Design a protein around this ligand. Structure first.
Ligand SMILES: Nc1ncnc2c1ncn2[C@@H]1O[C@H](COP(=O)(O)OP(=O)(O)O)[C@@H](O)[C@H]1O
Ligand SMILES: [Ca+2]
Ligand SMILES: [Mg+2]
Ligand SMILES: [Mg+2]
Lengths: 155, 800, 141
């Protein structure tokens, strides 16, 4: 909840770069709060960001860096899913139990349930990760689940 | 995919296309409604014990306390085949699922051991020979709810298990228990037929029985006015071998009295049909029903009743049964005479105190048909001859009196006759052949409360009371042997509990019935003498016996004391109970008929080696000994409305029946243990997403881990050796808990993806900043430079 | 800067008709004329005054390089533009670049905007950043 210089310094650079991408003036748009903290390694949910200040659309409220700390910190205390949390969930959509699931289902799960992902947000991640649909039309969710948790730059 | 499954199973896929409104276990529920019993609704706001809702139908607003609201079932539970599987099992949920399947053609629904049958009020393709072929040897669970399944399983249970079976059928009037009984019988005949016959003769027995046993009432146009227990005997190869019938409480008062728009027994309107004129003389009757006072009081016709065809058929009925012309006729004779007895008139002196007949045509026609002397008859009917010790005296009849002894004669004669009739039929059906096992079929009125209740009501209710205690006892054993069978165990009592006290108040030594019995052998006994002791021996001492309370419904008639039956506090009036129990009948007239010339009459009035309540209580203990020595099966008949319209449902009515039916009672009973259960295998698949960080990656193990993981309350559950036992409503919670958790985990994975996207782009944003930085910097220069009076002029010196 | 500095000497000398080795009020004042509307008092001093004292070349250079000082090359500026055309199409969409310039980074205002796109080479909705670069530097017109 309470940061060290190391942490506080990184937030600054990130906050900096974002402040620039919407007019350099020491303020960041309330709508990019989520996207700012994501760049710091946290994985907030839209309800989390809305609970600390975030807004629905651009141009409604701007926040100085001095109003971020409170926000950022609060956002570090939410729940981050774990490998198990995810696997079990996908397991519920898997009949047979041999770790499979229809591509359509996958896409269904991603944009239909929970705080939906946009269709463009989805086909973007499938490319980056390279989710290869097997002959029949299904996939191995185990992989997709690791890759997403593994990150873009994979160690 | 068959037509044989048209009115049996709805559509698994089409029901899955019930894709309109979603479901929030948090917002949808049931609420008290005057018109529809309950009312679907959405919770809006809360203020302690003040829940405000909006009705899906009229989108209005009403306020209801949090305690009157009842749980609602998710969509996947629509038209459920066994209501014992429902997450939430309650009043509003049972009402709804039944109404549900009904408005969809299905009339058969399970609910534990119970098989509910709602009157379709329209013949259906369900009972065909093709259908039967499908239910043969199929367990209950592997096929659409069907009465054929209750019967078949009673059968497969009979062979295999080598034990007596019994199938009890109850409900209100017009619920359709009589016609279901027929169906259970027709089913065996068609599955265990030896290879006219007995099967047939059993069918023929209904016509004659219904001839004297049934009548037209405002409720049913063919209401059986007596209770009947039928036992079908089978031989060592499982083939029908014999059968017998038992009867209970014939409604005698009807024989001489009809309420408006009601008729006496059918038989009277058949012998008055003139379908067989050649008999008109042997009976001495004129083909006009509205001519005799004992049957011309209410109405005379029935829509779906052809009194002429039916008389014809019953006449045929006695032949297939093997009745001699002599017997058959005796029947019509003794029956006809009751019509004339009501036509006998009497002259009351001017201002005095003794009576004398007024004509003889009636008194003669009677004596003729009765095989006695009309002078004798009118002499004993007028001024009798009693039987006082060592010196019998002469008793004087007033007016009235006489009238009361004529009706009492009819009543008493019709009863004796009817009893004879049943015993005769048994004679036929009893093929002296070895029987190993049997299967009985009960069919009596159910527990019923009215505006006004009397001695007749107490009897009925007192039977079902004993009969309900029998069910709770079957339930109790089954449950015990179930809990013990899975290693868990049992901690406690028996469901025949508060049933006993109520039953004891009635049938034990110094209880109600007992005092009525003792208070009858006293001449100067008053309706108050009776009220007096029954207050003395019980009010202020019994819990199950209290004083009248505040009227529950409109028109609550009068009452003297309240009885706490298992279906509620019923208000009784003991007015006249002393007259309704003992039957006054000329000890003199009896002796004369005793010596009658017609074999029947003589046999009807002989001696042996007595009273009502005493009779019934004896035949009841018999019935019970018998039932307590079989494997029960229950069918609960429910009448949908008071208009005989198909598909129409009346909430207050159905709810009422369920209250006294035994289905609600069998839910509260089951609640006491652990109702909903699951086999470890499913539990894990269903609730692993409730404690994933505790799973290794057995079956009972995982489960023990999830349960202990959620800090589950010890009482709330129990652990069997194959499945896990839960209290009622537990799994409902584990169900919402599973909705939020799947929801957030998903949201959370979406949140991980959003981060992965921005983290990847992060590098381009960094570079693109220096690039836009560049462009802005430079374009601004060329925008400066080309205006610097210096430069604009400097480049004007290089054109060399 | 190579031919850059070198050239200055060449410009420097023209920038002086007397050769007194310095650019006085006159030297500039009497070349310019050899061309057009010799400025108004306000302009000339304003100009020369940009220099604390007498123009010792070293002062010419320092002021001129001080002005450009912050510029970049052609291949550079056109590479910056090329960071927004991931496809390498050699052109950007007009509305895209008009938004990049006006609402992000160090936002242009309705003026800097009008001035920038007045002579912008824009065919069919496509802003040819390659030309525009030649236009600003001088490699073209
Ligand atoms: N299974 C059924 N199929 C068609 N009609 C039925 C069925 N069950 C009951 N009924 C209706 O109910 C009446 C018979 O009721 P019963 O006499 O069978 O009711 P209860 O046994 O309560 O006195 C008939 O007039 C008939 O229209
Ligand atoms: Ca900003
Ligand atoms: Mg009946
Ligand atoms: Mg000079």
């Amino acid at each position: 909840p309470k940061l060290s210089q190391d942490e506080i310094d990184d937030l600054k650079e990130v906050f900096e770069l974002f402040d620039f991408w919407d007019g350099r003036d020491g303020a960041v748009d309330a709508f990019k709060i989520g996207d700012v903290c994501r760049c710091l390694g946290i994985n907030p949910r839209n309800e989390d960001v809305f609970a600390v200040g975030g807004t629905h659309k651009m141009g409604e409220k701007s926040l100085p860096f001095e109003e971020f700390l409170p926000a950022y910190e609060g956002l570090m205390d939410c729940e981050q899913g774990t490998y198990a949390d995810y696997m079990e969930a996908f397991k519920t959509f898997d009949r047979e139990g041999q770790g499979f699931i229809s591509g359509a289902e996958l896409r269904h799960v991603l944009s239909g349930l929970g705080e939906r992902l946009s269709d463009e947000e989805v086909d973007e991640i499938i490319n980056l990760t390279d989710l290869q649909e097997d002959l029949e039309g299904n996939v191995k969710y185990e992989e997709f689940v690791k890759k997403v948790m593994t990150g873009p730059y994979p160690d | 995919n068959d037509p044989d499954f048209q009115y049996l199973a709805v559509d698994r896929k089409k029901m899955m296309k019930e894709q309109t409104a979603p479901f929030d276990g948090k917002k949808n529920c049931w609420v008290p409604d005057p018109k529809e019993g309950f009312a679907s609704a959405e919770i809006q706001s809360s203020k302690g014990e003040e829940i405000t809702v909006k009705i899906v139908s009229d989108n209005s607003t009403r306020t209801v306390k949090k305690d009157d609201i009842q749980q609602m079932n998710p969509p996947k539970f629509e038209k459920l085949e066994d209501m014992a599987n429902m997450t939430y099992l309650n009043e509003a949920s049972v009402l709804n699922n039944l109404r549900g399947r009904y408005t969809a053609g299905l009339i058969y629904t399970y609910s534990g051991l119970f098989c509910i049958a709602v009157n379709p009020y329209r013949r259906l393709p369900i009972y065909t020979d093709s259908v039967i072929a499908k239910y043969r040897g199929k367990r209950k669970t592997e096929i659409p709810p069907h009465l054929f399944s209750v019967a078949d399983n009673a059968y497969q249970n009979m062979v295999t298990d080598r034990e007596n079976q019994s199938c009890l059928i109850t409900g209100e009037s017009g619920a359709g228990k009589t016609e279901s009984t027929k169906k259970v019988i027709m089913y065996f005949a068609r599955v265990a037929a030896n290879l006219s016959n007995l099967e047939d003769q059993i069918i023929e027995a209904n016509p004659v029985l219904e001839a004297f046993g049934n009548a037209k009432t405002v409720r049913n146009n063919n209401s059986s006015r007596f209770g009947k227990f039928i036992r079908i005997h089978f031989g060592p190869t499982g083939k029908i071998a014999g059968a017998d019938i038992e009867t209970y409480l014939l409604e005698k008062s009807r024989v001489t009295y009809q309420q408006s728009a009601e008729r006496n027994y059918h038989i009277f309107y058949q012998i008055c049909s003139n379908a067989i004129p050649e008999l008109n003389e042997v009976m001495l009757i004129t083909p006009d029903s509205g001519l005799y006072s004992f049957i011309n009081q209410g109405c005379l016709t029935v829509d779906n009743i052809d009194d002429v065809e039916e008389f014809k058929l019953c006449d045929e009925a006695f032949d297939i049964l093997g009745f001699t012309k002599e017997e058959k006729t005796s029947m019509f004779k003794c029956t006809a005479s009751i019509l004339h007895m009501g036509e006998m008139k009497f002259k009351q002196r001017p201002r005095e105190e003794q009576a004398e007949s007024d004509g003889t045509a009636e008194a003669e026609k009677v004596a003729f048909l009765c095989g006695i002397n009309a002078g004798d008859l009118l002499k004993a009917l007028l001024k009798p001859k009693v039987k006082v010790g060592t010196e019998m005296v002469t008793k004087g009849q007033n007016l009235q009196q006489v009238i009361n002894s004529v009706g009492a004669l009819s009543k008493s004669l019709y009863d004796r006759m009817f009893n004879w009739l049943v015993k005769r039929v048994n004679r036929t059906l009893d093929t002296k052949a070895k029987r190993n096992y049997y299967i009985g079929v009960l069919d009596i009125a159910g527990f019923e409360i009215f505006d006004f209740n009397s001695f007749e009501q107490l009897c009925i209710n007192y039977t079902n009371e004993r009969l309900q205690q029998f069910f709770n006892h079957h339930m109790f054993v089954l449950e015990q042997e179930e809990y013990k069978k899975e290693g868990i165990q049992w901690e406690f009592i028996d469901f025949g509990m508060d049933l006993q006290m109520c039953i004891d108040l009635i049938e034990k030594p110094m209880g109600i019935l007992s005092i009525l019995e003792e208070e009858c052998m006293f001449p100067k006994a008053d309706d108050k003498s009776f009220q007096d002791y029954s207050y003395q021996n019980h009010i202020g001492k019994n819990r199950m016996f209290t004083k009248p309370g505040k009227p529950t419904r409109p028109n609550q008639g009068h009452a003297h004391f309240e009885l706490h039956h298992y279906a509620g506090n019923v208000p009784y009036s003991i007015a006249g109970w002393l007259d309704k129990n003992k039957d006054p009948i000329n000890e003199n007239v009896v002796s004369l008929l005793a010596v009658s010339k017609e074999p029947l009459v003589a046999e009807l009035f002989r001696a042996p080696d007595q009273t009502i309540s005493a009779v019934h209580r004896e035949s009841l203990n018999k019935l019970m000994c018998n039932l307590r020595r079989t494997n029960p099966h229950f069918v609960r008949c429910i009448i949908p409305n008071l208009e005989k319209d198909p598909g129409l449902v009346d909430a207050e009515l159905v709810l009422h029946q369920l209250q006294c039916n035994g289905v609600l009672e069998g839910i509260r009973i089951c609640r006491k243990g652990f109702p909903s259960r699951l086999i470890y295998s499913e539990f894990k698949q269903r609730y692993s997403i409730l404690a994933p960080n505790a799973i290794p990656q057995d079956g009972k193990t995982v489960s023990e881990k999830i349960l202990t993981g959620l800090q589950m309350d010890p009482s709330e559950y129990r652990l069997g050796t194959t499945k896990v036992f839960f209290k009622a409503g537990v799994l409902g919670n584990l169900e919402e808990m599973r909705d939020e958790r799947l929801s957030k985990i998903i949201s959370m994975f979406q949140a991980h993806i959003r981060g992965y996207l921005i983290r990847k782009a992060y590098k381009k944003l960094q570079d693109q900043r220096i690039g836009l930085s560049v462009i802005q910097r430079n374009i601004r220069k060329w925008l400066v430079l080309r205006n610097w009076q210096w430069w604009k002029l400097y480049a004007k010196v290089k054109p060399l | 800067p190579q031919k850059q500095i070198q050239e200055m000497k060449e410009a420097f000398t023209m920038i002086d008709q007397n050769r007194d080795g310095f650019i006085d009020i006159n030297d500039l004042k009497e070349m310019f004329s050899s061309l057009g509307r010799t400025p108004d008092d306000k302009e000339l001093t304003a100009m020369l005054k940009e220099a604390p004292g007498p123009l010792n070349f070293t002062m010419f250079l320092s002021i001129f390089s001080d002005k450009l000082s912050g510029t970049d090359s052609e291949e550079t500026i056109r590479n910056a533009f090329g960071m927004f055309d991931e496809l390498d199409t050699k052109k950007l969409n007009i509305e895209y670049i008009k938004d990049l310039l006006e609402n992000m980074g160090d936002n242009f205002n309705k003026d800097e905007m009008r001035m920038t796109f007045k002579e912008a080479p824009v065919e069919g909705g496509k802003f040819d950043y390659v030309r525009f670069v030649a236009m600003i530097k001088g490699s073209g017109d």
